[PDB]
From Swiss-Prot:
ATP binds at K18, K37, E86, Y87, A88, E135, N136, D149. The lineage of its organism: Eukaryota, Metazoa, Chordata, Craniata, Vertebrata. This is Aurora kinase A. Signal peptide: none annotated. Changing Y195A: Reduces binding to MYCN. Mitotic serine/threonine kinase that contributes to the regulation of cell cycle progression. Associates with the centrosome and the spindle microtubules during mitosis and plays a critical role in various mitotic events including the establishment of mitotic spindle, centrosome duplication, centrosome separation as well as maturation, chromosomal alignment, spindle assembly checkpoint, and cytokinesis. Required for normal spindle positioning during mitosis and for the localization of NUMA1 and DCTN1 to the cell cortex during metaphase. Required for initial activation of CDK1 at centrosomes. GO terms for molecular function: ATP binding; histone H3S10 kinase activity; molecular function activator activity; protein heterodimerization activity; protein kinase activity; protein kinase binding; protein serine kinase activity; protein serine/threonine kinase activity. The chain holds residues 126 to 388 of 403 of the full protein. GO terms for cellular component: axon hillock; basolateral plasma membrane; centriole; centrosome; chromosome passenger complex; ciliary basal body; cytosol; germinal vesicle. Changing R80A: Reduces ubiquitination and proteasomal degradation.
Length: 249
């Protein structure tokens, strides 16, 4: 189905990005709610990424898990391009997170699992995201976890493993590692004040749990945060892992 801007009304702007921004919008015929990524041909050009968006659409489209954000369609005009996206009412995890400091274990566990399955499905198609971070995981109405923004979902550093900063489905695991940490602590294991400062920390795997990071939580994160990609688990062992198991939903 070939679209056109004139088909939707426009609610508030959910966010504003470098390349454009996202407005709440409703489809005029079915009165259907969704988010609507808006981006500028000019801006995409001047940074040369017409590809990540051939290859974000070619992808997100082809995909259908609960925990992944369904890209419904696409179209463009003279100057900008429109992505017709699913809409997650409860906002981003990032906001949830900084909104309330850190997450309890259950909450964390859950997300991770969902995340994991979400991931497990993706890699079932040997697809890897490589852009995972709280500000890319949204919350559906039921409060579910949806993963979005496929800038670099092929086949700032806080979340990227060594392999990348210097890769197969491994990459993600690592990030999942980082991600878990933040969730429980409030910051990424390597948060550094300086770009180059970080690279160092990440390159060398220099993180340290506060006392309250009880349990094989501490374990799990270590288990994940390996420099040797081939030595991280798989989602299976992960959802399986007790601490997840005991706490997840
Ligand atoms: C270009 C560009 C990228 C972005 C980043 N966005 C990606 C995700 N965005 C949303 C998408 Br796509 C789908 N559903 C969304 N729902 C929200 C949302 C919902 C509620 C709230 N509030 C704000 C006010 N309040 C205190 C309660 C919670 C915030 C966000 N965002 C969604 C948008 C951002 N931007 O341009």
């Amino acid at each position: 189905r070939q679209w056109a801007l004139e088909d939707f009304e426009i609610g508030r702007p959910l966010g504003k990005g470098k390349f454009g921004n996202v407005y709440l919008a409703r489809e005029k015929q079915s009165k259907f709610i969704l988010a609507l990524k808006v981006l500028f041909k000019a801006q995409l050009e001047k940074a040369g990424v017409e590809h990540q968006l051939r290859r974000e659409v070619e992808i997100q489209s082809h995909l259908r898990h609960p925990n992944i954000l369904r890209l419904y369609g696409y179209f463009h005009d003279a100057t900008r391009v429109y992505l017709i996206l699913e809409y997650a009412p409860l906002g981003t995890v990032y906001r949830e997170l900084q909104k309330l400091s850190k997450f309890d274990e259950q909450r964390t566990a859950t997300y991770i699992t969902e995340l994991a399955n979400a991931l497990s499905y993706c890699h079932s198609k040997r697809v890897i995201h490589r852009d995972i971070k709280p500000e890319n995981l949204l919350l559906g109405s039921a409060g579910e976890l949806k993963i979005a923004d496929f800038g670099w979902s092929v086949h700032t550093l806080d979340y990227l493993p060594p392999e990348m900063i210097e890769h197969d489905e491994k990459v993600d695991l690592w990030s999942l590692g980082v991600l878990c940490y933040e969730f429980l602590v409030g910051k990424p294991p390597f948060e550094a004040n300086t770009y180059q400062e970080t690279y160092k920390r990440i390159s060398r795997v220099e993180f340290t749990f506060p006392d309250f990071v009880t349990e094989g939580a501490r374990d799990l994160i270590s288990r994940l945060l390996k420099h040797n990609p081939s030595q991280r688990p798989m989602l299976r062992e992960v959802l399986e892992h007790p601490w997840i198991t005991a706490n997840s939903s």
